[PDB]
Amino acid sequence: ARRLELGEALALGSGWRHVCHALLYAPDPGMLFGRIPLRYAILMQMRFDGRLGFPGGFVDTQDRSLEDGLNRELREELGEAAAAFRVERTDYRSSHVGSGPRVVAHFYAKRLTLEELLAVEAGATRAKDHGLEVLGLVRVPLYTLRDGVGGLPTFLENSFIGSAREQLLEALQDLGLLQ
Amino acid sequence: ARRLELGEALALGSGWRHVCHALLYAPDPGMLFGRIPLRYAILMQMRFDGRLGFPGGFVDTQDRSLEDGLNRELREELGEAAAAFRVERTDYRSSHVGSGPRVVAHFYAKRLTLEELLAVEAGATRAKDHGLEVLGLVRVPLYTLRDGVGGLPTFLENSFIGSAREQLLEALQDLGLLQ
Ligand SMILES: O=c1[nH]cnc2c1ncn2[C@@H]1O[C@H](COP(=O)(O)O)[C@@H](O)[C@H]1O
Ligand SMILES: O=c1[nH]cnc2c1ncn2[C@@H]1O[C@H](COP(=O)(O)O)[C@@H](O)[C@H]1O
Ligand SMILES: [Cl-]
Ligand SMILES: [Cl-]
Ligand SMILES: [Mg+2]
Ligand SMILES: [Mg+2]
Ligand SMILES: [Mg+2]
Ligand SMILES: [Mg+2]
């Protein structure tokens, strides 16, 4: 997929559709097996097509902004606990265009408290999309286990939608997790 | 992995450890996009190692039966809603031994009502293992989308622990889903 500057994406003609997705994350002081730092809780979802992706969806003709569309979709996807926050332009990270349909994909990362993130997980089964478009939420393991394979490297071998794997890796880099 | 009859597995010496996992499923009359029959809700979990597997765990020295160990582990894994049912010997399907450590893996499939299954999903964030060994629950997409790839075939391209992919496929066959 080609990366576009936000200005260029916003200048695309009306035939282009805009989709927005968000990486929700929270600092986590927890330790797996009492010794492996978790560092952050970072959410993805298993999608209806058997691929991992981020929560979000299409901006429609009555969204006044990309961010209004994103928050509307997040709340459909994830349920009422997503109404505890708004993802904003300050959280914007990137825009990409893939091959095929006229779709531009905008990506955001939003910091939550761990309590807010847990609340999103705890309420997700009541979301409109649960058991339809969204098959379940999962956290991303950020550590690599002693065999050098288990954890993040194996997680990254799963199937991902569109540019989601690249969006994840860019965000993990920006968080200082790939040093 | 080699398949063993239950009698043979139960005759293994004390140095062998026994692990038990369960496929929990419920009939689901729902339709994706109003046209694709879901057929069943079937649960798996994203594990700490980045692989998909089934809920369960090790039988210990104070479990009086394989099934007591299974139910104890399920309830640690999944939380209080798993106490609404017991997986029993009538639900037993298979035993396998892989290479390496002395572990025999017993597999079960347990029918729930859709309300019971939803309750398991709805309560899983309060489980002891949530955000540690268990990164999230996911449903298995049983359909194949119009491109011939999306849905089950793509789901099966994800990373799976041990014999979990084979256990899934055997269960799906037994349910008549691979006709
Ligand atoms: O998490 C994601 N990151 C980036 N693009 C995505 C993600 N999820 C869906 N898409 C894209 O969003 C559009 C709609 O996909 P859908 O979710 O299958 O309806 C397609 O162009 C997908 O590639
Ligand atoms: O869902 C599963 N199906 C079959 N074996 C499993 C499953 N999950 C874990 N195991 C096995 O259970 C044992 C313990 O694995 P652990 O969950 O990583 O502690 C190993 O022998 C794994 O291969
Ligand atoms: Cl380890
Ligand atoms: Cl389709
Ligand atoms: Mg969505
Ligand atoms: Mg949507
Ligand atoms: Mg377990
Ligand atoms: Mg356990």
Residue numbers in the entry:
A (entry chain A), B (entry chain A): 4 to 182
Copy out sentences from the published article reporting this entry, exactly as the authors wrote them.
While NUDT16 was incubated with IDP and Mg2+ prior crystallization trial, the structure contains a well defined product of the hydrolysis reaction, i.e. IMP. In addition, the IMP-bound structure contains two Mg2+ ions. In the IMP-bound structure of NUDT16, the two Mg2+ ions have an octahedral coordination. Both metals are coordinated to one oxygen of a glutamic acid carboxylate of Glu80 and Glu76, respectively. One of the Mg2+ ions is also coordinated to a main-chain carbonyl (Gly59) while the remaining coordination of the two Mg2+ ions is assured by water molecules, but where any of the two bridging water species might be hydroxide ions. The His24 side chain is involved in π-π stacking with the purine ring. Furthermore, the hypoxanthine N1 and O6 atoms make hydrogen-bonds to Gln170 and Phe57, respectively. Two phosphate oxygens interact directly with side-chain Arg50, which is a strictly conserved residue among NUDT16 orthologs and is involved in phosphate interactions in other homologs. The lack of direct interactions between the hydroxyl groups and protein residues might explain the lack of discrimination of NUDT16 between ribonucleotides and their deoxy counterparts.
Here we present the crystal structures of apo- and IMP-bound human NUDT16, a metal-dependent hydrolase of the NUDIX superfamily. One member of this family, human NUDT16, has been initially described as a nucleolar RNA decapping enzyme specific for small nucleolar RNA in work based on its homology with Xenopus laevis orthologous, X29. Further studies conferred NUDT16 the role of a more general, nuclear and cytoplasmic decapping enzyme. Enzymatic studies show that NUDT16 can hydrolyze both inosine diphosphate (IDP) and its cognate deoxyribose (dIDP) into (d)IMP and Pi.
